[PDB]
């Protein structure tokens, strides 16, 4: 349907242990394709996807040039920030960055993203209009004011629309097998007593792609979100995904409950009943 490609960069200082550590990973949708690591011995962009291993070495070279360029950018980004906020070098601080782009079912551009976060909170980030910056605190205004005056927002918008998209366009051909497939969940219920007057009802979804999904419990058709347990969606590690939600019920009123699953690989959503 719609599609996405994002690049995620984590850098971390280790004050005693030398240089900061830089980790970056490619993703199309919920499929990962490449990775790069400051501490790896390869020092190249390595493929994480079978359909991306086919690219020429002049592809790999140029990509690993640009990621290496980012890495030192962020290492100096970490120095600037310790300076800006006046934290002591003894502390270990973290700088996360993401950028990428979204396309419609025909493949035209939809949205685009360029953003950084310092110590798990937002530092700077590009607005949806792609003409301005949102800057949380008085530090990021300085970087805003650097990047406004230096015309950064113009140059990234040209990347995001021109480049970011065209690659996602080829990747989705290249990976037609995996990338564009969609997998319905295999679903079922399990029943796990606790006391003699109570039982636990768990509704499962297994082996689905993409990972966006909605699990729902109800009684008599009325919605039960109150007493419901629901776990975070977990990668099955084969490339598919897994999730479950569960409720506690008075025994024996169980068939009075319905579990409702919605996923993009489902022509019509389902209903499970015990």
């Amino acid at each position: 349907g719609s599609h996405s490609m994002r690049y995620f960069s984590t850098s971390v200082s280790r004050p005693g242990r030398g240089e900061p550590r830089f980790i970056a990973v490619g993703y199309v949708d919920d499929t990962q394709f490449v990775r790069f690591d400051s501490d790896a011995a390869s020092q190249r962009m390595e493929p994480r996807a079978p359909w991306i291993e086919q690219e020429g070495p002049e592809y790999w070279d140029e990509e690993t040039g640009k990621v290496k360029a980012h890495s030192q950018t962020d290492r100096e980004n970490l120095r600037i920030a310790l300076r800006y906020y006046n934290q002591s070098e003894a502390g270990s601080h973290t700088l996360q960055m993401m950028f990428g782009c979204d396309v419609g079912s025909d493949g035209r551009f939809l949205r685009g993203y360029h953003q950084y976060a310092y110590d798990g909170k937002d530092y700077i980030a590009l607005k949806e209009d792609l003409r301005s910056w949102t800057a949380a605190d008085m530090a990021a205004q300085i970087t805003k004011r650097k990047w406004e005056a230096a015309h950064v927002a113009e140059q990234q918008r040209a990347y995001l629309e021109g480049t970011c998209v065209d690659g996602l366009r080829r990747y989705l051909e290249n990976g037609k097998e995996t990338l564009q497939r969609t997998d319905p969940p295999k679903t079922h219920m399990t029943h796990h007593p606790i006391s003699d007057h109570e039982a636990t009802l768990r509704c499962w979804a297994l082996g689905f792609y993409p990972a966006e999904i909605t699990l729902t419990w109800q009684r008599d058709g009325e919605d039960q979100t109150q007493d419901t347990e629901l776990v975070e969606t977990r990668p099955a590690g084969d490339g598919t995904f897994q999730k479950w939600a569960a409720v506690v019920v008075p025994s024996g009123e169980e068939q009075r409950y319905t579990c409702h699953v919605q996923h993009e690989g489902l022509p019509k959503p389902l209903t499970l009943r015990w």
Partner: peptide, 11 residues
């Protein structure tokens, strides 16, 4: 295809 900022912009 990764961001190439030409000449790169730090803070």
């Amino acid at each position: 295809l990764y961001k190439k900022l030409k000449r790169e912009m730090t803070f």
